Ligand binder design. Structure first.
Ligand code: L39
Length: 422
Protein backbone atom coordinates (compact mmCIF):
# COMPACT_ATOMS: atom_id res chain seq x y z
CA UNK A 1 0.00 0.00 0.00
CA UNK A 2 1.37 3.36 -1.19
CA UNK A 3 1.17 6.17 1.51
CA UNK A 4 -1.31 8.19 -0.65
CA UNK A 5 -3.76 5.25 -0.19
CA UNK A 6 -3.50 5.43 3.65
CA UNK A 7 -6.02 8.03 4.71
CA UNK A 8 -8.95 6.46 2.97
CA UNK A 9 -8.04 2.77 3.63
CA UNK A 10 -10.49 0.74 5.78
CA UNK A 11 -7.63 0.30 8.28
CA UNK A 12 -7.18 4.00 8.75
CA UNK A 13 -10.87 4.82 9.04
CA UNK A 14 -11.15 2.00 11.65
CA UNK A 15 -8.17 3.57 13.47
CA UNK A 16 -9.66 7.08 13.59
CA UNK A 17 -13.00 5.72 14.79
CA UNK A 18 -11.35 3.99 17.71
CA UNK A 19 -9.82 7.32 18.78
CA UNK A 20 -13.40 8.22 19.90
CA UNK A 21 -13.14 5.57 22.57
CA UNK A 22 -9.43 6.13 23.38
CA UNK A 23 -8.80 4.80 26.87
CA UNK A 24 -5.90 7.13 27.74
CA UNK A 25 -3.18 4.54 27.14
CA UNK A 26 -1.34 5.19 23.90
CA UNK A 27 0.18 1.67 23.80
CA UNK A 28 -3.39 0.29 23.26
CA UNK A 29 -3.90 2.45 20.12
CA UNK A 30 -4.97 -0.09 17.49
CA UNK A 31 -2.78 1.32 14.74
CA UNK A 32 -2.55 -0.46 11.34
CA UNK A 33 0.86 -2.15 10.61
CA UNK A 34 1.82 0.52 7.99
CA UNK A 35 1.84 3.21 10.81
CA UNK A 36 3.98 1.06 13.22
CA UNK A 37 7.62 1.84 14.02
CA UNK A 38 10.08 -0.99 14.53
CA UNK A 39 12.00 1.22 17.18
CA UNK A 40 11.47 1.14 20.97
CA UNK A 41 11.16 4.35 22.98
CA UNK A 42 14.28 3.39 25.06
CA UNK A 43 16.27 4.21 21.93
CA UNK A 44 15.02 7.87 21.91
CA UNK A 45 17.55 8.77 24.63
CA UNK A 46 20.33 8.66 21.94
CA UNK A 47 18.76 11.76 20.45
CA UNK A 48 20.30 13.97 23.16
CA UNK A 49 23.79 13.77 21.66
CA UNK A 50 23.86 12.93 17.98
CA UNK A 51 26.26 15.86 17.40
CA UNK A 52 29.13 14.79 19.55
CA UNK A 53 31.20 17.94 18.93
CA UNK A 54 28.35 20.16 20.14
CA UNK A 55 27.78 17.99 23.17
CA UNK A 56 31.42 18.31 24.21
CA UNK A 57 32.10 21.88 23.08
CA UNK A 58 31.37 23.70 26.41
CA UNK A 59 33.94 21.55 28.23
CA UNK A 60 36.68 23.08 25.99
CA UNK A 61 35.80 26.71 26.72
CA UNK A 62 37.80 28.21 29.64
CA UNK A 63 39.14 31.56 30.97
CA UNK A 64 42.12 31.40 28.64
CA UNK A 65 40.41 30.67 25.36
CA UNK A 66 36.67 31.70 25.50
CA UNK A 67 36.68 34.46 22.81
CA UNK A 68 38.04 31.89 20.39
CA UNK A 69 34.98 29.59 21.01
CA UNK A 70 32.15 31.93 20.32
CA UNK A 71 31.75 31.97 16.54
CA UNK A 72 28.76 34.35 16.58
CA UNK A 73 30.38 36.82 19.06
CA UNK A 74 34.20 37.14 19.36
CA UNK A 75 33.69 39.85 22.07
CA UNK A 76 31.33 37.74 24.15
CA UNK A 77 31.45 39.16 27.63
CA UNK A 78 32.52 36.03 29.62
CA UNK A 79 33.35 32.30 29.39
CA UNK A 80 30.03 31.62 31.34
CA UNK A 81 27.98 33.21 28.50
CA UNK A 82 30.18 31.59 25.80
CA UNK A 83 29.37 28.20 27.47
CA UNK A 84 25.62 29.10 27.72
CA UNK A 85 25.66 29.92 23.96
CA UNK A 86 27.28 26.57 23.31
CA UNK A 87 24.78 24.76 25.49
CA UNK A 88 21.93 26.45 23.77
CA UNK A 89 23.35 25.47 20.33
CA UNK A 90 23.72 21.85 21.50
CA UNK A 91 20.14 21.82 22.72
CA UNK A 92 18.84 23.24 19.46
CA UNK A 93 20.86 20.57 17.60
CA UNK A 94 19.03 17.71 19.45
CA UNK A 95 15.61 18.77 18.28
CA UNK A 96 15.82 17.47 14.75
CA UNK A 97 17.05 14.11 16.16
CA UNK A 98 14.35 14.03 18.78
CA UNK A 99 11.45 15.11 16.59
CA UNK A 100 12.22 14.43 12.85
CA UNK A 101 14.18 11.17 12.76
CA UNK A 102 11.15 8.91 11.98
CA UNK A 103 10.04 11.33 9.31
CA UNK A 104 13.28 10.94 7.47
CA UNK A 105 13.81 7.26 8.06
CA UNK A 106 10.21 5.92 7.93
CA UNK A 107 8.41 8.71 6.02
CA UNK A 108 6.21 9.97 8.89
CA UNK A 109 6.01 9.69 12.65
CA UNK A 110 5.00 6.07 13.36
CA UNK A 111 3.84 4.38 16.60
CA UNK A 112 6.95 3.28 18.61
CA UNK A 113 7.34 -0.04 20.46
CA UNK A 114 6.21 0.37 24.07
CA UNK A 115 9.26 -0.79 26.00
CA UNK A 116 9.07 -3.59 28.57
CA UNK A 117 10.00 -2.86 32.21
CA UNK A 118 13.74 -3.22 32.65
CA UNK A 119 14.44 -2.93 28.91
CA UNK A 120 17.94 -1.52 28.33
CA UNK A 121 19.57 0.32 25.48
CA UNK A 122 23.39 1.02 25.44
CA UNK A 123 25.95 2.18 22.89
CA UNK A 124 28.82 4.64 22.45
CA UNK A 125 29.98 7.42 20.23
CA UNK A 126 33.56 6.38 19.77
CA UNK A 127 34.58 9.69 18.25
CA UNK A 128 37.49 8.00 16.42
CA UNK A 129 38.24 11.01 14.19
CA UNK A 130 38.84 13.36 17.18
CA UNK A 131 41.05 11.81 19.82
CA UNK A 132 40.60 14.81 22.20
CA UNK A 133 36.84 13.86 22.43
CA UNK A 134 37.23 10.27 23.74
CA UNK A 135 34.29 7.87 23.97
CA UNK A 136 30.84 9.10 25.02
CA UNK A 137 28.54 6.38 26.45
CA UNK A 138 24.76 6.23 26.38
CA UNK A 139 22.81 4.17 29.01
CA UNK A 140 19.03 4.10 28.68
CA UNK A 141 16.66 2.14 30.91
CA UNK A 142 12.89 1.60 30.96
CA UNK A 143 12.46 2.41 34.70
CA UNK A 144 8.63 2.15 34.59
CA UNK A 145 6.01 0.52 32.38
CA UNK A 146 2.80 1.64 34.02
CA UNK A 147 3.10 4.62 33.28
CA UNK A 148 5.92 4.36 30.71
CA UNK A 149 9.07 6.17 31.92
CA UNK A 150 12.55 6.17 30.24
CA UNK A 151 15.70 7.29 32.11
CA UNK A 152 19.14 7.79 30.59
CA UNK A 153 22.68 9.05 31.09
CA UNK A 154 25.15 10.15 28.46
CA UNK A 155 28.66 10.63 29.74
CA UNK A 156 32.14 11.53 28.59
CA UNK A 157 34.78 10.76 31.32
CA UNK A 158 37.71 12.24 29.38
CA UNK A 159 36.17 15.70 29.28
CA UNK A 160 33.96 15.45 32.43
CA UNK A 161 30.70 16.12 30.54
CA UNK A 162 27.70 14.15 31.78
CA UNK A 163 24.01 14.31 31.20
CA UNK A 164 21.16 12.46 32.92
CA UNK A 165 17.40 12.78 32.69
CA UNK A 166 14.13 10.91 32.47
CA UNK A 167 11.03 11.23 30.32
CA UNK A 168 7.26 10.46 30.64
CA UNK A 169 4.27 11.84 28.70
CA UNK A 170 0.58 12.40 29.09
CA UNK A 171 -1.55 12.62 25.98
CA UNK A 172 -5.07 13.23 24.84
CA UNK A 173 -6.90 13.67 21.59
CA UNK A 174 -8.65 16.93 20.79
CA UNK A 175 -11.98 16.94 18.93
CA UNK A 176 -10.13 17.69 15.68
CA UNK A 177 -8.26 14.35 16.31
CA UNK A 178 -5.01 16.20 17.03
CA UNK A 179 -2.94 14.49 19.76
CA UNK A 180 -1.77 16.95 22.42
CA UNK A 181 1.27 15.78 24.34
CA UNK A 182 2.74 17.11 27.57
CA UNK A 183 6.27 15.87 28.45
CA UNK A 184 7.21 15.24 32.12
CA UNK A 185 10.75 15.04 33.34
CA UNK A 186 13.90 17.09 33.04
CA UNK A 187 17.56 16.58 32.04
CA UNK A 188 20.71 17.83 33.73
CA UNK A 189 24.05 18.51 32.15
CA UNK A 190 27.29 18.93 34.04
CA UNK A 191 30.22 20.46 32.19
CA UNK A 192 33.08 19.85 34.64
CA UNK A 193 31.89 21.77 37.72
CA UNK A 194 29.18 23.90 36.01
CA UNK A 195 25.51 22.68 35.67
CA UNK A 196 22.60 23.04 33.28
CA UNK A 197 18.92 22.16 33.75
CA UNK A 198 16.93 21.54 30.64
CA UNK A 199 13.14 21.12 30.35
CA UNK A 200 11.63 19.45 27.21
CA UNK A 201 8.64 21.30 25.63
CA UNK A 202 4.97 20.37 25.15
CA UNK A 203 4.05 19.18 21.59
CA UNK A 204 1.28 18.11 19.21
CA UNK A 205 0.96 15.60 16.50
CA UNK A 206 -0.58 16.79 13.30
CA UNK A 207 -1.43 15.15 9.92
CA UNK A 208 -3.43 12.32 11.65
CA UNK A 209 -6.54 12.82 9.44
CA UNK A 210 -4.35 12.48 6.38
CA UNK A 211 -2.42 9.52 7.78
CA UNK A 212 0.84 11.46 7.65
CA UNK A 213 1.57 12.22 11.36
CA UNK A 214 4.33 14.74 12.33
CA UNK A 215 5.41 16.44 15.55
CA UNK A 216 5.15 20.21 15.99
CA UNK A 217 6.57 21.79 19.13
CA UNK A 218 4.79 24.53 21.16
CA UNK A 219 5.13 26.25 24.60
CA UNK A 220 8.61 26.80 26.04
CA UNK A 221 11.79 25.04 27.04
CA UNK A 222 14.16 26.40 29.73
CA UNK A 223 17.89 26.06 30.13
CA UNK A 224 18.98 27.29 33.58
CA UNK A 225 22.62 27.34 34.46
CA UNK A 226 24.38 27.28 37.86
CA UNK A 227 26.04 30.47 36.57
CA UNK A 228 22.63 32.20 36.96
CA UNK A 229 22.23 32.58 33.20
CA UNK A 230 18.87 31.44 31.66
CA UNK A 231 17.85 30.67 28.09
CA UNK A 232 14.11 30.60 27.32
CA UNK A 233 13.09 28.91 24.13
CA UNK A 234 9.62 29.37 22.65
CA UNK A 235 8.38 27.20 19.84
CA UNK A 236 5.70 27.65 17.10
CA UNK A 237 4.56 26.20 13.71
CA UNK A 238 4.59 28.48 10.56
CA UNK A 239 4.48 28.42 6.62
CA UNK A 240 7.67 25.08 10.08
CA UNK A 241 9.55 24.00 13.29
CA UNK A 242 10.34 27.55 14.34
CA UNK A 243 11.53 29.01 17.63
CA UNK A 244 12.80 32.16 19.22
CA UNK A 245 15.28 31.81 22.10
CA UNK A 246 16.50 34.54 24.48
CA UNK A 247 19.35 34.39 26.95
CA UNK A 248 19.13 36.54 30.12
CA UNK A 249 21.69 37.49 32.80
CA UNK A 250 19.23 35.84 35.19
CA UNK A 251 15.75 34.59 35.64
CA UNK A 252 14.34 37.87 37.06
CA UNK A 253 15.33 39.58 33.77
CA UNK A 254 13.49 36.88 31.76
CA UNK A 255 10.25 38.61 32.72
CA UNK A 256 11.20 41.43 30.31
CA UNK A 257 12.06 40.48 26.69
CA UNK A 258 14.02 43.71 26.04
CA UNK A 259 16.51 42.55 28.71
CA UNK A 260 17.68 39.66 26.50
CA UNK A 261 21.50 39.59 26.06
CA UNK A 262 20.95 37.76 22.74
CA UNK A 263 18.03 36.64 20.58
CA UNK A 264 17.97 33.60 18.33
CA UNK A 265 15.25 32.85 15.79
CA UNK A 266 14.60 30.55 12.90
CA UNK A 267 13.88 26.83 12.36
CA UNK A 268 15.46 24.14 14.61
CA UNK A 269 15.17 21.75 11.68
CA UNK A 270 16.87 24.29 9.38
CA UNK A 271 18.62 27.57 10.02
CA UNK A 272 18.42 30.19 12.77
CA UNK A 273 20.22 33.47 13.31
CA UNK A 274 21.25 35.38 16.39
CA UNK A 275 21.32 39.09 17.34
CA UNK A 276 23.04 40.62 20.33
CA UNK A 277 21.63 43.45 22.59
CA UNK A 278 22.83 39.21 12.88
CA UNK A 279 24.86 36.03 12.29
CA UNK A 280 24.18 32.33 11.46
CA UNK A 281 23.73 30.44 14.74
CA UNK A 282 22.84 26.83 13.69
CA UNK A 283 22.15 25.18 10.34
CA UNK A 284 20.64 21.77 10.82
CA UNK A 285 20.93 20.95 7.13
CA UNK A 286 24.75 21.48 7.15
CA UNK A 287 25.45 19.20 10.10
CA UNK A 288 24.61 15.46 9.59
CA UNK A 289 23.62 13.40 12.70
CA UNK A 290 26.29 10.88 13.92
CA UNK A 291 24.63 7.60 15.04
CA UNK A 292 25.82 5.85 18.18
CA UNK A 293 27.79 2.58 17.76
CA UNK A 294 25.65 -0.29 19.04
CA UNK A 295 27.12 -3.74 19.45
CA UNK A 296 26.19 -6.49 16.89
CA UNK A 297 22.88 -8.28 17.55
CA UNK A 298 24.61 -11.67 18.15
CA UNK A 299 26.61 -10.06 20.92
CA UNK A 300 23.56 -8.39 22.61
CA UNK A 301 22.17 -9.39 26.02
CA UNK A 302 18.59 -10.40 25.74
CA UNK A 303 17.46 -7.36 27.94
CA UNK A 304 18.80 -5.02 25.29
CA UNK A 305 16.20 -3.40 23.13
CA UNK A 306 17.09 -4.35 19.57
CA UNK A 307 17.79 -7.95 20.60
CA UNK A 308 14.61 -8.13 22.60
CA UNK A 309 12.38 -6.69 19.78
CA UNK A 310 14.10 -8.36 16.78
CA UNK A 311 11.32 -10.71 15.68
CA UNK A 312 8.67 -8.07 16.32
CA UNK A 313 10.63 -5.55 14.19
CA UNK A 314 10.97 -8.20 11.39
CA UNK A 315 7.14 -8.68 11.38
CA UNK A 316 6.33 -4.97 11.32
CA UNK A 317 8.70 -4.58 8.31
CA UNK A 318 6.69 -7.31 6.55
CA UNK A 319 3.47 -5.61 7.71
CA UNK A 320 2.08 -9.01 8.73
CA UNK A 321 -0.87 -8.70 11.24
CA UNK A 322 -0.73 -12.29 12.50
CA UNK A 323 2.96 -12.49 12.67
CA UNK A 324 3.12 -9.20 14.68
CA UNK A 325 0.50 -10.40 17.13
CA UNK A 326 2.36 -13.78 17.45
CA UNK A 327 5.94 -12.32 17.84
CA UNK A 328 4.55 -9.89 20.50
CA UNK A 329 3.18 -12.82 22.62
CA UNK A 330 6.47 -14.75 22.30
CA UNK A 331 8.34 -11.58 23.37
CA UNK A 332 6.16 -11.35 26.47
CA UNK A 333 6.83 -14.95 27.48
CA UNK A 334 10.61 -14.60 26.80
CA UNK A 335 10.75 -11.47 29.00
CA UNK A 336 8.76 -12.97 31.86
CA UNK A 337 11.15 -16.02 31.63
CA UNK A 338 14.15 -13.66 31.40
CA UNK A 339 13.13 -11.83 34.56
CA UNK A 340 12.73 -15.06 36.50
CA UNK A 341 16.36 -15.83 35.61
CA UNK A 342 17.65 -12.39 36.58
CA UNK A 343 15.92 -12.90 39.92
CA UNK A 344 17.34 -16.44 40.47
CA UNK A 345 20.81 -14.99 39.93
CA UNK A 346 20.20 -12.27 42.46
CA UNK A 347 20.23 -9.51 39.78
CA UNK A 348 18.11 -6.44 40.28
CA UNK A 349 16.49 -5.91 36.86
CA UNK A 350 14.14 -3.13 38.04
CA UNK A 351 15.99 -0.16 39.35
CA UNK A 352 19.07 -1.22 37.58
CA UNK A 353 21.05 2.01 37.01
CA UNK A 354 18.61 4.66 38.19
CA UNK A 355 16.75 5.18 41.46
CA UNK A 356 13.54 7.01 42.16
CA UNK A 357 14.32 9.86 44.62
CA UNK A 358 11.61 11.49 46.66
CA UNK A 359 11.80 15.32 46.67
CA UNK A 360 8.40 15.79 48.41
CA UNK A 361 8.13 17.28 51.87
CA UNK A 362 6.71 13.91 53.08
CA UNK A 363 9.03 11.07 52.09
CA UNK A 364 8.54 7.58 53.38
CA UNK A 365 10.72 6.51 56.33
CA UNK A 366 13.43 4.67 54.34
CA UNK A 367 13.13 6.58 51.06
CA UNK A 368 15.92 7.93 48.80
CA UNK A 369 15.97 11.71 49.28
CA UNK A 370 18.06 14.54 47.85
CA UNK A 371 21.35 15.48 49.60
CA UNK A 372 21.61 19.10 50.85
CA UNK A 373 23.41 20.69 47.90
CA UNK A 374 21.31 18.79 45.28
CA UNK A 375 21.86 20.20 41.80
CA UNK A 376 18.22 20.00 40.86
CA UNK A 377 16.92 21.94 43.92
CA UNK A 378 19.45 24.66 43.34
CA UNK A 379 18.71 25.12 39.57
CA UNK A 380 14.88 24.82 40.04
CA UNK A 381 15.11 27.43 42.76
CA UNK A 382 17.11 29.73 40.40
CA UNK A 383 14.37 29.36 37.77
CA UNK A 384 11.40 29.27 40.15
CA UNK A 385 10.61 25.85 38.61
CA UNK A 386 8.20 23.53 40.40
CA UNK A 387 9.96 20.42 41.85
CA UNK A 388 6.79 18.31 41.63
CA UNK A 389 5.65 15.83 38.95
CA UNK A 390 4.03 18.65 36.89
CA UNK A 391 4.41 18.99 33.03
CA UNK A 392 8.03 19.93 32.18
CA UNK A 393 8.78 23.63 32.67
CA UNK A 394 5.92 24.12 35.11
CA UNK A 395 6.75 27.15 37.32
CA UNK A 396 6.04 27.46 41.02
CA UNK A 397 2.48 28.71 41.49
CA UNK A 398 1.37 27.66 38.02
CA UNK A 399 -2.06 25.88 38.08
CA UNK A 400 -0.34 22.45 37.65
CA UNK A 401 1.91 23.15 40.69
CA UNK A 402 0.84 15.64 43.59
CA UNK A 403 4.06 13.59 43.98
CA UNK A 404 7.71 14.73 43.47
CA UNK A 405 9.44 11.49 42.43
CA UNK A 406 12.60 11.95 40.12
CA UNK A 407 14.85 9.26 38.51
CA UNK A 408 18.61 9.80 39.13
CA UNK A 409 21.52 7.92 37.57
CA UNK A 410 23.81 6.10 40.00
CA UNK A 411 27.20 5.76 38.27
CA UNK A 412 28.33 3.00 40.73
CA UNK A 413 25.52 0.72 39.51
CA UNK A 414 26.92 0.83 36.04
CA UNK A 415 30.54 0.48 37.27
CA UNK A 416 29.41 -2.69 39.11
CA UNK A 417 26.89 -3.82 36.46
CA UNK A 418 26.75 -7.64 36.45
CA UNK A 419 25.98 -8.38 32.77
CA UNK A 420 25.69 -5.51 30.26
CA UNK A 421 28.77 -4.28 28.39
CA UNK A 422 29.38 -1.80 25.61
C1 L39 B 1 2.06 7.73 15.14
C2 L39 B 1 0.98 8.38 16.00
C3 L39 B 1 -0.32 8.56 15.21
I1 L39 B 1 -1.59 9.94 16.27
C4 L39 B 1 0.70 7.54 17.25
C5 L39 B 1 1.02 8.41 18.49
C6 L39 B 1 2.33 7.95 19.04
O1 L39 B 1 3.13 7.32 18.24
C7 L39 B 1 2.93 8.91 20.10
C8 L39 B 1 2.90 7.96 21.27
C9 L39 B 1 4.39 9.26 19.70
C10 L39 B 1 4.53 10.17 18.44
O2 L39 B 1 3.52 10.56 17.77
C11 L39 B 1 5.81 11.16 18.66
C12 L39 B 1 6.42 10.58 19.92
C13 L39 B 1 7.40 11.54 20.71
C14 L39 B 1 8.55 11.97 19.83
C15 L39 B 1 9.71 12.38 20.50
C16 L39 B 1 9.90 12.37 21.88
C17 L39 B 1 11.17 12.91 22.28
C18 L39 B 1 11.90 12.00 23.36
O3 L39 B 1 12.99 12.62 24.06
C19 L39 B 1 10.96 11.41 24.39
C20 L39 B 1 9.76 10.68 23.68
C21 L39 B 1 8.95 11.70 22.78
C22 L39 B 1 8.14 12.69 23.62
C23 L39 B 1 7.97 10.76 21.95
C24 L39 B 1 6.84 10.04 22.84
C25 L39 B 1 5.81 9.21 21.98
C26 L39 B 1 5.20 10.09 20.82
C27 L39 B 1 4.30 11.20 21.41
Amino acid sequence: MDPSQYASSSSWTSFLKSIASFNGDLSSLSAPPFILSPISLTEFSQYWAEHPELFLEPSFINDDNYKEHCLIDPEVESPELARMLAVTKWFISTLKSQYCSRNESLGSEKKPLNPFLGELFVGKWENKEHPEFGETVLLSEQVSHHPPVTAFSIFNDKNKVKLQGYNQIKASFTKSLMLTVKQFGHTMLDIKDESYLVTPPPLHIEGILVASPFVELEGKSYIQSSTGLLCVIEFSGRGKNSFKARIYKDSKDSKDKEKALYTISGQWSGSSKIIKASRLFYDAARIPAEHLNVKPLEEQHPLESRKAWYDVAGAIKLGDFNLIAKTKTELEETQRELRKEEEAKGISWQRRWFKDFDYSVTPEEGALVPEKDDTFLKLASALNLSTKNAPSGTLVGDKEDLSSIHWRFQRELWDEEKEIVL
